[PDB]
Amino acid sequence: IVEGSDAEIGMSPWQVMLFRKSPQELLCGASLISDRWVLTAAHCLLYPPWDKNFTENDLLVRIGKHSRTRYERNIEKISMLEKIYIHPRYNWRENLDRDIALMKLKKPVAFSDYIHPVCLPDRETAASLLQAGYKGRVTGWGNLKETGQPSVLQVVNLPIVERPVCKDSTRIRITDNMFCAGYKPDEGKRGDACEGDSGGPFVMKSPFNNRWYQMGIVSWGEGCDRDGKYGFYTHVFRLKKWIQKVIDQF
Amino acid sequence: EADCGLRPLFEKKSLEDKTERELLESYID
Amino acid sequence: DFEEIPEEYL
């Protein structure tokens, strides 16, 4: 997260760190959506142009974390993967369309002051909140600059951007399964996700029922916090049918 | 989870975090 | 620079 700030304790208790077993590194962000299901970006698991292809036993989910590098004894819980499910029409060849994946945990995680699931949107929520100018919140342990790393979880609030501005900011083909967020150069304020924030949640707090919903997944950008560029996010509600089917099946 | 999206250290004890009001002020409808 | 985790997590 570039130009964000330290998170408060318990501020994003659905935050998950995907952690590589060997070598022990940050792989990506993710989010807790029930006591046994974790949501992330498919590119966190599968990205053949970079030879990335991870299976269940290559990693661990760390939940309830605040510090990036420390083993937060008596606070975080570290879980094992039972199965990974990537969207079957995830488009890694082109533009990362449908950049979404689910991971089922071997055992349920216990909720705590630091560990709690976020909500997924239904149609009225998405239509209500996914509006140009409405701000969401992105969190992660990723890079602080485009070209080091944070001691603790970072947070940034960013406004959703009109579809035409998003499209005009890039040569890439934007789909209905994406949205972009960030301040325009004219707006003066700053902030973006970046390398390492991949997979983590873009959340909004409904003013109707005062619950936090995950509207987006950190998916891609060109550089980080660059003037006139925006961050691109997976549109969680557009892929909700697939999420339901996988959870209902497995 | 019928209790999703309600944080033990914030919503569940009627405490607000430092920048959530910023989101609320952007939700102009 | 990551602190080691408990061996139980493998």
Ligand SMILES: *[C@H]1O[C@H](CO)[C@@H](O)[C@H](O)[C@H]1NC(C)=O
């Ligand atoms: C690479 O990932 C797995 C091995 O982990 C392999 O079965 C798969 O066919 C490869 N790539 C694709 C596109 O999944």
